[model samples]
Target: GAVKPTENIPSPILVEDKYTEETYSRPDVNFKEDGSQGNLSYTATRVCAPMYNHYVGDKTKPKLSAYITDWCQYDARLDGGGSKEEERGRGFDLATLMQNPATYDRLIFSFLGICGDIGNKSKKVQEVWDGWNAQAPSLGLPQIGKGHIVPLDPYGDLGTARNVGLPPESADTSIESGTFLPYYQQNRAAGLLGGLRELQKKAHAMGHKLDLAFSIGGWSLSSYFSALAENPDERRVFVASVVDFFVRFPMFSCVDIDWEYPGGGGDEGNISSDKDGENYVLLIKELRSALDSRFGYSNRKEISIACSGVKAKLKKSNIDQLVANGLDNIYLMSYDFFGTIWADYIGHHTNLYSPKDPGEQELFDLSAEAAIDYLHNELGIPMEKIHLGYANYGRSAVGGDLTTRQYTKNGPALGTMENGAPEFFDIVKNYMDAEHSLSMGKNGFVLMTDTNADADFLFSEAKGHFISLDTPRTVKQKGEYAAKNKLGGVFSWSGDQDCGLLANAAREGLGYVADETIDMGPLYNPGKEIYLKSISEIKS
Candidate 1:
């Protein structure tokens, strides 16, 4: 496929009212589905408007406050080398993210994954968190303190590190592959909630918050523990020790029990063989008891379960119980909606539409809408507690029909089209693909504001050459949805995941800050509700 210079689309036979951005480069995209803007990407300046983005703000509320989390490499998933640092602080270097002043308010030190095994506690990490807090606060950005501890495997005694200790394998800690050891020798030892405590104390004293979470890729438990020891009994002791630790100090604000499916149902590295929800259920109940004992029920950390989007169907009952059992939140997996091998386009975790594959609609129906509705309507969970997931990564174009590669598929990116243009519809996905496929992956996914698109303006790709992603138009859609729904808040996977302007777009639309208000805001005459809803309707 040739490199795409413009956004193109399939012929009218495949598309609806297609004028193509080339012939009708109308900057107005009527997101209302009313056929007002003959072009899907272009809209009327007064009619169709852009939504506000919380990340991009005005003088008042000019910042975004989000988890700004780093969990990808935590479970020892990635081999490292990517995460960098910002001028303000240290931790994961989400490049474009740090630069986009609009999208992020604070940076959270979600230091999990491979870094846990090599617990050297870099000075850079501390600098990142501490500096970010100081800088962000001073800059009028949201200053989210650091919490969430690392340096220990979430899957204790489960695998790679068979940490030594007692029964249930939940309280075990004598693992061979923990941060307690150096890189060269296998000087394994059972150090009590060892390592990083000093750093944690330092962060706390520096006005940062410290938090902790357990893995839900609960299967990794075996893998993490196995790396530490060979004997199974020793692993049991390790679990017991952890349980006791939780009992003694429940200072963690959020405990993420990373489990996949019941009976260890999913693929490798992400599944647990324990069927009937016995393993996860027992783990939560026991951990809750420990948490209760440590905090006397008042300040104990609220538990969170990180499960796959499919859990809506496979583990609904278990999910409901998590709430019943005193659980505080459920961070559903919205990413990985489609495996890497898919040929059709899939949402990060919940794709709203897919003309190529109607089946995708059904799949998302349950996870995004149905499951959410169930949790709120059927299970008695509050709407605020259930947050939908979105992704900062891009998916591969599987075996889909790339013959029309040059033509931009009006929908989301499925793969590359025939023409060579990056087929992903939004900057986030486009940048992600570029980073992964190209060397500039780090710099590519920054918050970008296409001056040409301008806030509230819609754009279409040239016919047979460009695809109208309409950056501002896309932001308006997302922003309005978040505001209209009053969601927990729209969150990005990482700050630098999109064109450096996405955060700004989000901030403007979400109405986070007044200064960063979207160009569409003016049309609202006071933050246009109709425009926001219309854009959301079109995008959804």
Candidate 2:
């Protein structure tokens, strides 16, 4: 029998107010069909799209070899609970999901960082949520929405339901009783465990490998990091638990620490003064020791860190300390320069460089090129250790009239889901024509490109709206930049968005050609150290 699809499953209930039919858009968006020599390293962050098929459409299956996090669909079994019923009925348990062999060269499953402290809650997965109120007083901890903890599964793509004003339900209740189930058990039976074992056997027969990972401390988890780091005992416990969990699943290949920042504006509520940088080093060393001691030195799993591209947020000394301490890869978050909460004015949010025309409103200007240079030259970090971060989504704003002047005055633009920000899929659906073609004079929206910035945008003269977005062109531009700079590789915030076009762009940008059927032959070299290069010793 076919597995139960996510749409049939009941959704979690939360608070909301009112609805807006309007929204995010694009520029001469065309997907490339040609292929290139597979030369660049590419990885994607797989959000909730696999659990829910509706977001990606009924036919869209998740990449077999991909990344999964514990943010949504909490399976009781994965978290130490022993339940045969839970394993059979749940929607894609982490263990089961990890077994499926990827069509791509490598698969990385990431156990997401802890977002909230759910103590004895009746509901299995207690998502921390609050109304979208920016001015709410800071509570000095993760207040659900404030500290980057998305209340619902972002991969579920049910933001539209929220706009229509879904009635709020009582916490710690069952799904049928108006309260949505947080665990994967809510979905119908899928025979996940048996299917996974079968899938693993089939993958092995077909000559493929799967790499799983445990990711600790994301944006929401950042608040609690200081306390955990300060206490040696607590930190040790955390590391031991994580190692034990990964060890249980021998398929896991590495561990990634996704703490957004140590101490800065990035970490608004979570601020720590207790040698946080040094403490982070100490924690990593501890984690490394535990993994090595258990798994043995030669078979030790790698440790990677997701770091901010901003020099201020990522102190040179801190990075230096991590590298000297033997950190593997540094996934540089080069995107999100401009968004609803992050920016006051509008410009190309994640361009390669600053736009040529910057009005008075342009306060923050960031580009991938600039970030890489700073990390490599100023910070003295090896380019090879840096995996340039790319995003499939775009930043938008309202009240920006279309004119020759770039980045005009603009107030907050509304988004279908988030604050004036929408994923690539949402932008294409709402803004673009049925033909998937956008134009400046002919189309209702005017398509504009900032050559200097190496980014694109769409301006609505009538609506006074502007969308700063990344298309295949911009992605290719950034990928080319990575190749030119001799950086480690390029990765995206998620695999769920951009319809896999962004992934294609990354491959193309690195001088490799890819089509609908991706060729995994070049990427399958097991012994070759992919992320090993210095600026002075770059490959031709």
Candidate 3:
């Protein structure tokens, strides 16, 4: 049954730093030391190798998490640029930025935004892509390449829309191909395969990483795809069509489906995006098999689930299960935390003024913290594997009308969801930046609050009538926590959300340091309720 050892097996020093000569001993049986032997032998040594395993491999002095915030820059799913600005002009070509010693090793990039070459018919997309390839390698960061191609199916259920003045196509509504199956199925397939091949070529040439994102439950957004899956026969055919299409892609290292929340349908409960969470699990398993069968060929392609980290308060174990079930990483959709949780004292996703309205704000950032703890401690996931989500754009509002202070919302501000979930592409960040740039870290700024400074903080409205948000000094404390924890890097929903300060702050961790601080002095205005002082003012 088992191969017998003919000679003594050598083992390394189990516990190096600790001065102990502990040997494996069997308590069950005892025998004389002369020629006699014990009945059983040790199966494996029990010890910890904290030094070699933990420290050396780690890309240390671990910087804050980083991501593409593609939704801000380009939402290919929506089919074009999402931000107010085309390219933020930070001079960052992901590969080049990642290649930079300052940013490389500690940064991870993703572009699951609304921009990708919409139609396969255009070869011109290559020209737009060439620049991306040119600068990426120089940066030296791991390439989380182009995700979900735009115009996947121009005539599909998503109805991503057209590039110019072309009218929207008639929505698909057949039992088998009604939603988008019949209309854009071929186009989506062709687009995905073509994009993947292109991404693979670009990434390998430029020396980067690629994770091709797909959608299983995303198609249900429009009534087209939803109606197609109403019955058993139609559902089976629809699922098969999806599997066949994705499985045939040229190469996909990883595929992520945005299975939204538990019931986040456009109709009833938008929170649970798919309503059929458990069914989606089955679909995931089925798709996993198909992916493994083809592109996964002996583990070439890895499967990752881009689930809503915020809406679904997934336990560490549940997330671990996803990881075990072929998921490489959990892409936390942390941006929408602030989207319409409530009217008056609502906390925006990843808002600096968190724990606002005391208990009123959803503890989204805290949820992020808990997820990190669980992934590292419970699931034992590596820090390099953890990805912090970000929003590249900012929520738009004239302001909300609050009991204490007028929050300011004018003429139905942009990006507001009826249920919540603020729109990413629509919201702009410059306004928020102008209002509280000094007190908060803008331009991809990050902070953490510690146990000591966790307290009730207040903010005041200013000349623009912008309601100020507050976070405990603990926000900076959490930055240090991220360093200690060893996460991969942060990701913004899109780069547009990052004000000049936040963007500059992200670069700070990647070895980018601030040379000069803005001279934002105390607000001597009459209509302001300043609870805590700014970093500069406190220093002054």
Candidate 4:
């Protein structure tokens, strides 16, 4: 069977047969059961936005951050290669972020990062916290001295190199300094707390509010998280550390735990136990209790968990307990269904719908819509509080037309980055945009859409490079889906990857009608409400 690019139905046919049209593109208005316009309204407590330190100054090539002016940049290395001095202190400064207060509501700093052990005494931990405090004044956002405490990998053990109980390393260490501290400092020096404080101050001046949160336990740091959950004393220690940090920095209003998977699947040494889900639930409960105790009743900070979208992981975990533990929101990591190394056959990596079977194994049997539906049904989580994750990057595989390729035999697609993956910005610059010599429409490479999957891909028949990705068109539709479903919000994996397309689509799709007069403060407390309700039901 030959794969055809998805063709849009004619306008007349679209009106005549609404079913295919509805799936093809987002509807202008939500329809009522009786076919009238549905007057739906829902309040989102928070909208988690992304910020990364990947962008930096590069005199040789076009800078990634330069493509998107609105993105909150962090001081980090230039994407692939750059001199340490050139990469250092080269990103959107605090003033740049403060200048566009309305563009960002909440900024989740890329990572709090992990070190040896769960304690806060490690040199890795101290460097980040100390550098954060020290670098803020240099960035001109001195208020970070009173910023939030971001805990990374509270449940993980560190290797001797990362946690040998050494004194905090110097803040001046660069990537070339030969010390591992530079990996933390390069980005930490961006002054996330100060930048958020500056943005909050600017937003407040306009009578709006901004939020700051630290992400803990990404794919790398989550190795030992599940095992630590089995220990009662360790659980309390982890919870206590986070709570104490928050208590000290009352201005920091949220904590984002980026636990990649529950039942298993992360870094090599950090694979999960079967009891990971159960332990994770207990951990969430303790953290919620500690946060409530520390922040108090008047103005409580938030706690969000970035959970896997895979049904198997979701099923094994106690999702209901997590919600019941006053978990503020659930970030559905719904992207990356397939990758060069992960999938047997090439398909849309982050498709909204399952692609038509190309006679190959489907990637994890997952889709964003399916994940959303599963959470709503299996965990009984309300759609309004479940945020769908979007990826600003795409996965590639070196094969002929992916639809017709051998499922398991086709090799990896060579990309400009890791594992044949390319940032959306690079895709646009090198392939799609008219300015690039190898532009898609002009050359053998053609941009194709999979209407059934609600995804876009680039195929170069001449070169056999097949890349699956989300374009502005596809992302906006997903955003519309979120809005129509009244989901919490949309979050991109990175702020630096896409050319501001994903973020714009989300802002538009999520019903962001920015009125300066509107007071943008955290209002709804579904987590608290659900927690109380669950307790009442359990007691009864």
Better of 1 and 2 by lDDT: 2
For candidate 4, write residues 1-540 as lDDT tens digits: 322222431111001222212321224223221111221101000111122111212222110111121122322232432223223221333443454554545666545543233333345555545555555565553422111233332211111111111122412223321222222221232234333444566777875555666676666556546655777766775676577556544556777777777776545566578888788888888888887776777798888887776666666667788888778778877777777766655656776765344221224435777777878986789987787777777776665544444333345454433445656654543444322211133234566665545566776664566667776556656667877887767777765454344555555455554322111111110110001111112224
Instruction: Give the candidate number with the greatest lDDT.
Output: 4
Ranking by lDDT: 4, 2, 1, 3
RMSD values for the candidates in order, in angstroms, are 16.6, 14.9, 23.7, 16.6
Please provide TM-scores, in order, for all candidate models, with all chains considered together: 0.48, 0.62, 0.48, 0.66
Which runs of model 3 end up more than 4 angstroms from their true locations?
A: 1-203, 215-248, 263-275, 297-299, 309-320, 340-342, 351-367, 371-385, 396-411, 414-483, 495-540
* Poorly placed runs, candidate 2 (over 4 Å): 1-111, 115-210, 354-363, 401-412, 432-443, 515-540
- 1-540, model 3: which lDDT tens digit per residue? 322222331322122211111111323322111102231111111111110110112334433333332222222213221122222112112222222212222222232212122333223223323433444465552222222132223222223222211123422223121233333332442222232334345545654444444433332222222223223444454445445445544343445544444344222422233424444444455556665665556656545444444433443125555555555556555444433323333233453222322331233233355456556786677776665654443332334432332344232332221222222211112112223322332222222222212321122122122222222122233334455565555544443222223333333333323423222221111122223322222335
Q: Write down the TM-score for model 3.
A: 0.48
lDDT of each: 0.34, 0.47, 0.33, 0.50
Span of ten consecutive residues with least summed lDDT in model 4: 523-532
Tens digits of per-residue lDDT, candidate 1, 351-405, equal: 3222222232333222344445555676666755554444433343222221222
Model 2 RMSD in Å is 14.9
Full-model lDDT, candidate 2? 0.47
